[PDB]
Amino acid sequence: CRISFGEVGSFEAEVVGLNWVSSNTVQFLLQKRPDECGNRGVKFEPGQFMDLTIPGTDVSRSYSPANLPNPEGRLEFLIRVLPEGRFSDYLRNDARVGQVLSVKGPLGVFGLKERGMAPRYFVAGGTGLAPVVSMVRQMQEWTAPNETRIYFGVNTEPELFYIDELKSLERSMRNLTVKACVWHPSGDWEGEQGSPIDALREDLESSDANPDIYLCGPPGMIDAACELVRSRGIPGEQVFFEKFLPSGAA
Numbered sequence: 485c486r487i488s489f490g491e492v493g494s495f496e497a498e499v500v501g502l503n504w505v506s507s508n509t510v511q512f513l514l515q516k517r518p519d520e521c522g523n524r525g526v527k528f529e530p531g532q533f534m535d536l537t538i539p540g541t542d543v544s545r546s547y548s549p550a551n552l553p554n555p556e557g558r559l560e561f562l563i564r565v566l567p568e569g570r571f572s573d574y575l576r577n578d579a580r581v582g583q584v585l586s587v588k589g590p591l592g593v594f595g596l597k598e599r600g601m602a603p604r605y606f607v608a609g610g611t612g613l614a615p616v617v618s619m620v621r622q623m624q625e626w627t628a629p630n631e632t633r634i635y636f637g638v639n640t641e642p643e644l645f646y647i648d649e650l651k652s653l654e655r656s657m658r659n660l661t662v663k664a665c666v667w668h669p670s671g672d673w674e675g676e677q678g679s680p681i682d683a684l685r686e687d688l689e690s691s692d693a694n695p696d697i698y699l700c701g702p703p704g705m706i707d708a709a710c711e712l713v714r715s716r717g718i719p720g721e722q723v724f725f726e727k728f729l730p731s732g733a734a
């Protein structure tokens with residue numbers, strides 16, 4: 485018998501998916517038990533989030549997964565993997581489609597909180613915004629048909645994408661605003677638009693980000709964005725920041 489002595493809030497997922505959507509990005513779909521397979525019953529949650537190890541080891545980390553508004557069970561994560569790295573090699577050498585991985589983390593992902601009807605900006609750094617984009621659409625389809633602003637950024641871009649996806653959101657409706665990050669990096673960029681988040685610093689000084697500010701990505705957008713706010717003055721009420729994946733956030 486395997487090890488078992490204290491497991492409250494864990495689920496079982498069968499590795500069947502695991503497709504490479506981008507150069508250093510992959511969408512893993514696991515379904516093997518009630519939670520993210522067939523008995524979890526989804527309906528669009530605040531970016532569901534848990535804690536799991538590649539093969540269940542115990543030295544990985546927590547990742548906010550997303551299924552979609554549908555009572556079934558399908559978790560899809562956007563992990564930034566780098567060929568020859570440390571997780572991408574182990575992902576294909578220990579996370580193939582012939583195994584079982586249990587996810588443990590009856591928790592949520594706090595980063596973007598809409599006040600109902602107000603211009604809010606959510607800047608996600610990277611592709612791990614999968615949960616971000618999921619929760620984003622939920623607000624618009626919920627009762628947030630107002631001005632919903634979203635900030636998307638990463639590296640050079642040739643390795644990333646989803647620009648048209650959010651762009652369509654802006655083209656769709658609800659006073660949407662899409663931010664164009666990246667300048668000329670390559671996948672190691674702390675921030676968004678070429679610069680030390682200086683642009684956002686001025687935005688506070690101007691007007692368009694304060695009431696509700698959502699930050700998703702590296703801890704930098706948290707350190708710098710939080711600094712500009714305290715340095716300038718831009719007093720916010722529904723402002724929130726989250727630390728996910730490497731560089732890509734303010």
Ligand SMILES: Cc1cc2c(cc1C)N(C[C@H](O)[C@H](O)[C@H](O)COP(=O)(O)OP(=O)(O)OC[C@H]1O[C@@H](n3cnc4c(N)ncnc43)[C@H](O)[C@@H]1O)c1[nH]c(=O)[nH]c(=O)c1N2
Pocket residue numbers: 507508533544545546547548562563564565566569570571572592593594611612613614615639643644670671672727728729730
């Ligand atoms: C609530 C919450 C929510 C999340 C997360 C945590 C928490 C608490 N995380 C973090 C989570 O731990 C996640 O699984 C890891 O940070 C992913 O790192 P790997 O272990 O996959 O590293 P991995 O070993 O794969 O390391 C990736 C490496 O790839 C290289 N690289 C990155 N981008 C590149 C590019 N464009 N071009 C070339 N090389 C590049 C870099 O050198 C980088 O260090 C996350 N993580 C995540 O990725 N997405 C998410 O959505 C979330 N969400």
